[PDB]
Amino acid sequence: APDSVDYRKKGYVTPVKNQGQCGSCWAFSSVGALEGQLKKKTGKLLNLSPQNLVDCVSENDGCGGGYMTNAFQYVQKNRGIDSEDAYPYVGQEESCMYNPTGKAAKCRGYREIPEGNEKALKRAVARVGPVSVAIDASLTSFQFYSKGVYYDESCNSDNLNHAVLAVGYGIQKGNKHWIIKNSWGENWGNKGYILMARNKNNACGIANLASFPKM
Numbered sequence: 001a002p003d004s005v006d007y008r009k010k011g012y013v014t015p016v017k018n019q020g021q022c023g024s025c026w027a028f029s030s031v032g033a034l035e036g037q038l039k040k041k042t043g044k045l046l047n048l049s050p051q052n053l054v055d056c057v058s059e060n061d062g063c064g065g066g067y068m069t070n071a072f073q074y075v076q077k078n079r080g081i082d083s084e085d086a087y088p089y090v091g092q093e094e095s096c097m098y099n100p101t102g103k104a105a106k107c108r109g110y111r112e113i114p115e116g117n118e119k120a121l122k123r124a125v126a127r128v129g130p131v132s133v134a135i136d137a138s139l140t141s142f143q144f145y146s147k148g149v150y151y152d153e154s155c156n157s158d159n160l161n162h163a164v165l166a167v168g169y170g171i172q173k174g175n176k177h178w179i180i181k182n183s184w185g186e187n188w189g190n191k192g193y194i195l196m197a198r199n200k201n202n203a204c205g206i207a208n209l210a211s212f213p214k215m
């Protein structure tokens, strides 16, 4: 695998979104992974619909949280996911709507990364594209991140409470990192992104619940 990967440089990553008043991080993480695969398959970069997932993935709890694997499974069973334009984001759970011409991507299943294995996560990011990951984002140091390679020894790898998207990896001034796209707007972190410590004993649980969709 390469030493450094950044899918933003290849045009595989859409603009940073803002989930607003809804605990729908999982839907943003899921659509980000789908968007990367759609770009890889077709050449098209476009916004897929987190709202379609919030409203329709009945195994998840809409604005009260969810898993990305449940989302991928839904998109597969549903035979598609709508574009953002067809099924726009409203930031509250509503009834599941059917748009006859709304479909913009499909999913053929998913794979999970071996639990806790950062080398395996790296290899998947290199081979596949952006990968959905879960982390402990509960610390003030994370919430108020602005710069650098984030590491806090108080982060709890077993407290997975936020879903984000690994869009690459690399090294900054000798500190290995994951490049992480959040869904709290461009005004959060570094233009909506955070660099998280890599190969520091699975810091914040970054490799504990990682998955990517098949397309």
Ligand SMILES: *C(#N)C1=NC([C][C][C])=[C]C(C2=[C]C(C(F)(F)F)=[C]C(C(=O)N([C][C]N([C])[C])[C]C3=[C][C]=[C][C]=[C]3)=[C]2)=N1
Pocket (backbone or CB within 6 Å): 022, 023, 024, 025, 026, 059, 060, 061, 063, 064, 065, 066, 067, 068, 133, 134, 135, 160, 161, 162, 163, 209
């Ligand atoms: C985002 N946004 C976000 N916000 C909250 C708090 C506001 C609702 C919680 C979560 C969340 C993330 C994750 C993840 F992605 F990190 F893994 C997991 C959960 C969660 O606790 N789940 C249940 C855990 N167990 C039953 C052991 C996942 C879940 C939640 C609801 C329905 C299905 C699955 C929460 N993200």
